[PDB]
Design a protein around this nucleic acid. Structure first.
Lengths: 141, 185, 57, 131
RNA sequence: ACCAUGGUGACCACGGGUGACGGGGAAUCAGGGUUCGAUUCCGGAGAGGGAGCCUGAGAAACGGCUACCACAUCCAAGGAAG
RNA sequence: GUAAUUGGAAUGAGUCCACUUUAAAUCCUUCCGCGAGGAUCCAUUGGAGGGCAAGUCUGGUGCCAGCAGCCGCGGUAAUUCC
């Protein structure tokens, strides 16, 4: 059992602080190696350039090809793969466009059936990807 | 630096969970039977009704003989007896804890000018307040959420500037006088 | 094949564009609450039907 | 003329400033805001003076019209009205003259004089020829 | 300067890290807590990095000086001012 | 509520003289003049299988294209895509 007596508040407090290093949500926030390693570097968005239009196969229950890219960030430059979350918007992007990749929804875990993507693309070439879908804005001539 | 005020707070509160079917039907029939614009101004008076019960139920957990619930409690009573939501006869700490949301939507200016017959068809009462036709004694008010006190509750009337109390008709009749008088008599 | 990287936008490129037709404008704001309070509560249904929803076909 | 009623409240006389100061509330139902040249000649026939020492300001109208209210005062001499009176409200009337340059102009003149030492034969006309 | 051999430590010294300015406070809310506070109030620190001074009641001052280090200005090439 | 015909001591957004405001100004208030029948003086952002309020309507595509935080939906009649 636990140590209950009055005056053990050194032992109860020093045991609680090194047992919080055993779950995810403390240790990925309070160690430092989980923020040096995400590509955004503690940010919600980052800009980058388009390197390769790539297609990844969906999971076994599903059978489709998810249209992704190979963003290389203009800040602390490093390689990510990012998803283009729309119907025809692989065609609105092209080689070495600048994009604004966002989070994909659940902070460094993939959503859905796209294996090993962690980000989604908004705002290719400074105009929104939703505005290019709906046609409110066009690609810059 | 600056001589700015710096103090603001929220008047409403969003519910603990959305899309529970029994709430938004019993809170639709408040949006339509008193004719309000959006459901944020039902959350307004619900948050008004919330912190009154917050203060009062924190008084009811205390016994008899001390100062502070004399002073906060007697004040709380005379402040909502003068507003009309509670009567002057039975003012207690007990009877405020059964007080409902419908008792505050009655004390608005927006429905105290339907039940005095200065407007029919309760939606028309907003179309008279905001459209500058209804005064409290010497002060016209275009605010439907004006919670009218029991003292100045008789002196609601059309203004002397109003179409319905005074004169100099507006542009829609004055166009109609001129419209047959463009080339003829 | 199974659609590797071409035919992106395959179904939006060949959907037939049905035209967007127009209606008289919606009453907005405080009038929007009036016309749907009146559809749900002061319009009591004469018949049964296990209280079928407001978008039945 | 018809309904322009001039009342007051919170009256005070003080011989510290040789003035008589009051809070003026103007009752006008169906008009616009009365001018201050309209007001100060009406206190002159209320306080038995002439409208050269009545200085009024700060009129703000209530919502709906009717009662507007401002602060006003009366001096005991136009010489007093030139000494213990701030200079803008003395100039609303034609009693003070403030036509200077902009403070952009005045500040550049000051930093140009600073670079020229001693000579009254150059500080006075330090760059005043180009006009 | 001459002496004595001491001070501190598992009740965490010492070293390292901090994405550390401290506090009044801020979001949260059964109680107990958890997080934030660079930011108008108070206190401190520094005016590119260090260092040394003048004057003055009060500065190791930077919209004061002096020197090195870093960057940078005009030049008639001799020098001037950051 | 379809669907109106109208019109009425209805009104603002806008437009624009005059005061007020202010160091001088602009705003807000105050008040002439105009200013509303698809009042075209135009309300949007998201959803509609479950969690979770709302369609087993119609066409199109046929494990493709895509959707889907999660379970999942799509292989020729999809209440989940366009």
């Amino acid at each position: 059992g636990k140590c209950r007596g009055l005056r053990t508040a050194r032992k109860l407090r020093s045991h609680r602080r090194d047992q919080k290093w055993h779950d995810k949500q403390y240790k990925k926030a309070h160690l430092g190696t989980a923020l040096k390693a995400n590509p955004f570097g503690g940010a919600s968005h980052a800009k980058g350039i388009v390197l390769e239009k790539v297609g990844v196969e969906a999971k076994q229950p599903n059978s489709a090809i998810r249209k992704c890219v190979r963003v290389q960030l203009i800040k602390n430059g490093k390689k990510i793969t990012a998803f283009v979350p729309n119907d025809g918007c692989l065609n609105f992007i092209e080689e070495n466009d600048e994009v604004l990749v966002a989070g994909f929804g659940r902070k460094g875990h993939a959503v859905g059936d796209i294996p090993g993507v962690r980000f989604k693309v908004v705002k290719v070439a400074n105009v929104s990807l939703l505005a290019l879908y709906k046609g409110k804005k066009e690609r810059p001539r | 630096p600056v001589a700015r005020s710096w103090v603001c707070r929220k008047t409403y509160v969003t519910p603990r969970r959305p899309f529970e079917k029994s709430r938004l039907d019993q809170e639709l029939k408040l949006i339509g039977e008193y004719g309000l614009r959006n459901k944020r101004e039902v959350w307004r008076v619900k948050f008004t009704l919330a912190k009154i019960r917050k203060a009062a139920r924190e008084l009811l957990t205390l016994d008899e003989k001390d100062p502070r619930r004399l002073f906060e409690g007697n004040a709380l009573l005379r402040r909502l007896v003068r507003i009309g939501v509670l009567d002057e006869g039975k003012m207690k700490l007990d009877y405020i804890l059964g007080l409902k949301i419908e008792d505050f939507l009655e004390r608005r200016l927006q429905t105290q000018v339907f039940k005095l017959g200065l407007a029919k068809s309760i939606h028309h009462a907003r179309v008279l307040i905001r459209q500058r036709h209804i005064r409290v004694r010497k002060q016209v008010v275009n605010i439907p959420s004006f919670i009218v006190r029991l003292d100045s509750q008789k002196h609601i009337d059309f203004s002397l500037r109003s179409p319905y109390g005074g004169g100099r008709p507006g542009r829609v009749k004055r166009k109609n006088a001129k419209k047959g008088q463009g080339g003829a008599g | 094949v199974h659609g590797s990287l071409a035919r992106a936008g395959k179904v939006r490129g060949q959907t037939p564009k049905v035209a967007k037709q127009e209606k008289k404008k919606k009453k907005t704001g405080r009038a929007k609450r009036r016309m749907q309070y009146n559809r749900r509560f002061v319009n009591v249904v004469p018949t049964f039907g296990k209280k079928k929803g407001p978008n039945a076909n | 003329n018809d309904t322009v009623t001039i009342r007051t409240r919170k009256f005070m006389t003080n011989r510290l400033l040789q003035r008589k100061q009051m809070v003026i509330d103007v009752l006008h139902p169906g008009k616009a805001t009365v001018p201050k040249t309209e007001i100060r000649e009406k206190l002159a026939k209320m306080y038995k003076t002439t409208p050269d020492v009545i200085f009024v300001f700060g009129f703000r109208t209530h919502f709906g019209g009717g009662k507007t209210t401002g602060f006003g005062m009366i001096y005991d001499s136009l010489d007093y009205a030139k000494k213990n009176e701030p200079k803008h409200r003395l100039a609303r009337h034609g009693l003070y003259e403030k036509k200077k340059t902009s403070r952009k102009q005045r500040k550049e003149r000051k930093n140009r004089m600073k670079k020229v030492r001693g000579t009254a034969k150059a500080n006075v006309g330090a760059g005043k020829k180009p006009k």
